[PDB]
Symmetry: T
Subunit: 67 residues, 12 copies
């Protein structure tokens, strides 16, 4: 059984780096992370000093573990 958590990563550099930010957080807290699907991308502009790219991903992990 796989379970997915919906995380939005952020980066001041790129959409790829924002996806990595989310995946990094998932790997810090969950075992057996296996893949991530991008579901949305955007850019925060007014409210931050530098534009901040955001990439929302469903990050899937295999259970027999970490729900």
């Amino acid at each position: 059984v796989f379970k997915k958590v919906l995380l939005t990563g952020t980066s001041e550099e790129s959409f790829t780096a924002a996806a990595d930010d989310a995946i990094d957080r998932a790997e810090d807290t969950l075992d057996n992370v296996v893949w991530a699907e991008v579901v949305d991308q955007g850019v925060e502009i007014g409210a931050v000093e530098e534009r901040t790219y955001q990439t929302e991903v469903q990050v899937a992990f295999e259970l027999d573990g970490s729900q």
Copy 2:
């Protein structure tokens, strides 16, 4: 990093009040709730005494916290 939980709030009054019900529950259990996106709305009819409006929301919260 933001994380989202998918909650369906209910209200016997309105769709707005059903969205608030879900957000209220999120704030009872999570720190740093920042926004909610409506993803579905419906009405429970047969099975309840009074029609019950339901609003499903993705409620986003900022981590460095509450996963």
Copy 3:
């Protein structure tokens, strides 16, 4: 078996009241109405005296009855 009819309710007050308008009509003509799913919302402006909120719902009813 459930069957659904696609109805657009109207109200000069709110989207919730427009959903109720459609459900009310379904209950006037069908037995065993069990739930409604919102599929669209809009507002009629030019053509009416007062803005008219509209909510389109799939209204589900249980058969062994009313097709």
Copy 4:
């Protein structure tokens, strides 16, 4: 020919009132506003004092005018 502008209205009261906020702004600046279609709804939470409901609408107006 109709043209649409994509506006997000806000309200501290309800989703219907947030749709009205957007339509009100359209009527302040455009002639012949004829209808609005809801395309998204959400709630701003962290960043405001009171939750702020938002309703995004495509507001249509008839040209021979106001592009």
Copy 5:
């Protein structure tokens, strides 16, 4: 308030049995599971000995409990 978890069940027999696999896991760990909505289906081929059917479901459970 209902909450949903996004689980992908697997089965070497059928899509229905893969949906049951996910629901079974949800019932092992959560109280008040009430329904599941299918959101995707697929088949793992290269990487397994036997084709493995997968069915992804949003499994809903009623809170006053198990978040």
Copy 6:
């Protein structure tokens, strides 16, 4: 001209059998049923003794008949 009715079939066995349940009901009441398109699948859990698989289909029938 074809017309479609939106029916949700149920089965305690499988998604295929739930699609058949809906089609069976359509054939009991309509002439010239020609095809069905699956539009949603789900499982009722809490509220029934046994899980009940549901498959929602648009069932198309040719008119010159049965509207």
Copy 7:
């Protein structure tokens, strides 16, 4: 209250003429037909002598009447 029926019109000439075919059938059997929304278009090839264009429309009619 408006109600919609989902009809697929056919024509050996064009997609517009296939939409008209469906609307024509609706007007033969229902009062107060007010608009139609196109939801799908296709072409039947193998099975007919001449290609047959099909246009599926939700045809809306105002009730106080014809459900």
Copy 8:
């Protein structure tokens, strides 16, 4: 950079002619119109003397110009 305007053209003849109506209006008011994407089609029935076909298009134009 390209920018798009969302226009609904109308025609008493066909969906293609309604798309042309919208594009014609865009070319009357904007420089460098390069393409149009159809996003919706429908037919106005009750409210007009003759059925009026409508085609909604995103019409794209290249800037260094006409925003």
Copy 9:
């Protein structure tokens, strides 16, 4: 087993004629073409002398043949 190829037909006359253009090409190269589903429509403007209507279709053909 049916297989589909995704083709975009073009025409300087209409969307129906652009769908036919794609189907014509499929029939020139494939046996047992059975139907086509429209998936997108658009108009090429800047880059051509005359507007060129385009209709993208999934064209289905029955195998035991032409993959």
Copy 10:
């Protein structure tokens, strides 16, 4: 690099068996088939002696091979 072919399998038994039919055909003609994603399901009724379940899948295969 992976490539996908869009195939509709058929079965007089079930949706799972119809997905297998498509995958079987892909494996007869392509090397390195790795997974399949279900994209549509339906049932052929009028035109066949027995209802025929159909499952449309994108079947993915790894290249360095079989385009």
Copy 11:
């Protein structure tokens, strides 16, 4: 009230840089740009010397200003 403009940015380097191109143009002409949502990505190949990445974004800006 927020308003959105639909812009397609281009870059010969990356999808992130193409999103920035669109946002840059919005900031040159509009006050209070607050965020951008990615809605499509693509690559122009035949017609340019170097592949050109394109990212289409809805760029939102707060009014009390720049419609």
Copy 12:
């Protein structure tokens, strides 16, 4: 007439580079490649040594050629 092939490119560097990987393969085997539309993005994690970014694109090429 344009035809599209659905390819998933991979890269250990970025989503843009994964789109290029797919396009590169298309240009190795097809004449007149004209554009690519991104349809999905994801990241392979468990199963590879280094995260592998994937970008799925519909790559369009003009026929009078390479089907």
